[PDB]
Design a binder for this molecule. Sequence first.
Ligand SMILES: Cc1ccccc1-n1c(=O)c2c(C)c(C(=O)C3=C(O)CCCC3=O)ccc2n(C)c1=O
Ligand SMILES: Cc1ccccc1-n1c(=O)c2c(C)c(C(=O)C3=C(O)CCCC3=O)ccc2n(C)c1=O
Ligand SMILES: [Co+2]
Ligand SMILES: [Co+2]
Lengths: 368, 372
Amino acid sequence: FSKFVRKNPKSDKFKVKRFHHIEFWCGDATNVARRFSWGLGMRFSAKSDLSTGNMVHASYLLTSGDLRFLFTAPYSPSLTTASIPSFDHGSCRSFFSSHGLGVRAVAIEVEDAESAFSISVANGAIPSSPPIVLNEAVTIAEVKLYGDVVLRYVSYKAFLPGFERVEDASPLDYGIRRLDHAVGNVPELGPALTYVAGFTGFHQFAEFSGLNSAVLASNDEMVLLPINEPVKSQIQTYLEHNEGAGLQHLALMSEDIFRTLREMRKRSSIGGFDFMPSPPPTYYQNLKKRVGDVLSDDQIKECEELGILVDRDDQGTLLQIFTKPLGDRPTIFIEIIQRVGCMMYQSGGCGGFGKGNFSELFKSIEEY
Amino acid sequence: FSKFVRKNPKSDKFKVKRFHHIEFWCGDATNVARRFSWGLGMRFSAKSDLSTGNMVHASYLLTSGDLRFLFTAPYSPSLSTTASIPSFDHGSCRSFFSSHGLGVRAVAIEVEDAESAFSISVANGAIPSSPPIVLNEAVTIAEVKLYGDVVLRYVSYKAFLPGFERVEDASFPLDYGIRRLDHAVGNVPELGPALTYVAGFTGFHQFAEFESGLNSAVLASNDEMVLLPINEPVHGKSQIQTYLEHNEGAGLQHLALMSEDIFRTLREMRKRSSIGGFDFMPSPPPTYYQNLKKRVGDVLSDDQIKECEELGILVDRDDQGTLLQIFTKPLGDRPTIFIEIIQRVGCMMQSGGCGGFGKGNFSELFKSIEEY
Ligand SMILES: Cc1ccccc1-n1c(=O)c2c(C)c(C(=O)C3=C(O)CCCC3=O)ccc2n(C)c1=O
Ligand SMILES: Cc1ccccc1-n1c(=O)c2c(C)c(C(=O)C3=C(O)CCCC3=O)ccc2n(C)c1=O
Ligand SMILES: [Co+2]
Ligand SMILES: [Co+2]
């Protein structure tokens, strides 16, 4: 008889709602956005460039359900008319030169961005962009998260001002619906948790080689922000190639992971994304004894064909798989997950974040 | 009652064979290469990156017949040489991409001897960019300046490049029919000094041609397989001056990719414009294709003209042959470099420059828009 007790102080210092968007910073946003669109199955739904009147930066929005990926690249400084107020030309090129293609801003929806900005800075956060109202409708603010990644606060009053809608009859959809969590890599986890939880009030989400991890969650546990430190270690290899702290991977949730994985693997060799090598077959015959009450044998058979990892915790089950690095550097990659269980409308973090797969993947290799 | 005479001095100062490859300079070569591979139907052939030992730059080679597109992005200098291409520089790559954006860096041509072609080039006025460097005692590379920040690269073998590994076929890989790069066109503020410079050290002759806002001129090798047109803006709006502003100076404007079948390729490319490929310029009016049976009805049937109207192909004709062509939208953020898809018909003995370069389609499109 085992029981796992979880505690949630709900110590959020301001009102946080949901993940808003993710802003990649590119050198040329057109080719990065068009490739992520075909590989992930995300629709071209908004733009802010020369064709809209923007002479400062080219920004393209891909949407799949609620998930929103923004791809921003700077124009020539000799051409303000920008839509993103915090965008500085020198920062973007310096960001790309030292880190490569990576995530710049992790945006979350708050009831009020300036209040969220004032409480954060008063609780240790280093500011990055002041609260700025746009067309008397949207307010944006940015604070330092880690390295050159910023935590962005978005608030409404009822995509963004300056963006034009894009409607086409393409329409790409592989099943992915929202962003589940965003993980970062830092040298020292202690000072990072002290910092981030210090100004957000996020509580630590309990759990259950080469890394130490901890998950900061919001009151509703829908905004999840894990952080990794190295202890060979893939975390250290990230810090070497990214040159300091940075976002490690974006965990993307889909309403069907089998539908998504089928679409993404078909396109791996024709512009999409490739995946890590699959587990040995002993991993998948040892599944009916581990998760035989949640997945049928056909569904176990579907994971074996698509290289899907399955792990279990105190209350749910997590199907997951990882892609290869998205760009040149062995840095940012994508995680595709589907959470099963915890229906009360579903609890955030249902099934965990796949820590148990480290022991289970190892265990299955000695048998094979 | 009419005839067009063409003179060929054959004044190449060194033996020029054929186009070798085109090197794009990117910020991230992985997302650009997988983009071009899907949109153009080119196969992953060779790589030179971290998985290969290279910690200075990442370079991926896409091939389609004999066409070769190289995409190079700089790694961080903190990973320190192991670079496969000796003329690479992290400072120049970041500076080139910051100044002009995604564009062509090197136009590589195959020659008899790169040590010979470099010495004669500089001796006849060319500005050097990379001395001839024998690599693995098997191939020689040298670079002289061409346009603004575009270099003319000489590739000569002794019997892709050493340092690369052949990428085994991942699948029946992608092939849309594109077989070869026809010509590479650049934009320049003054056609005068550009012609005297380039033709001054190459020895290339002026390939004569048989309103818009440009004055053009085509340089060609003796066999007329390496075609390098140069464009200048005509003022008094011009898409070249627009190019010069956003490109932050001179640079390569477009590349013509010859296809063994232009209808195949256009169907495949247009199939993918909405799903990550390349978009195309708006199609001509329906009166443009109703005017085709009299212009070009002796070489194209009523169905191939019907296939041009559906795919949006431009048809032009000169004294020697015919030309089918179509143009994509700019490949990157800035409206700078785009891609041309052509197929030349006739001039069989196929001659270089068969059908011309579509310069008769400026007035032909205008003559078909002016239809009530
Ligand atoms: C895929 C891979 C390649 C080369 C080195 C390692 C891996 N690798 C992972 O990176 C991996 C991750 C990143 C998670 C994961 O998502 C997760 C973390 O463990 C950090 C805490 C929060 C979180 O969400 C889970 C399982 C993983 N597993 C099982 C795996 O093997
Ligand atoms: C002008 C323009 C504006 C917006 C989109 C498309 C166009 N556009 C072209 O760019 C265009 C080109 C580029 C050629 C062409 O290939 C060419 C030259 O114009 C110069 C001589 C060497 C050469 O190769 C031929 C016809 C063209 N036509 C008919 C056209 O409409
Ligand atoms: Co994760
Ligand atoms: Co052309």
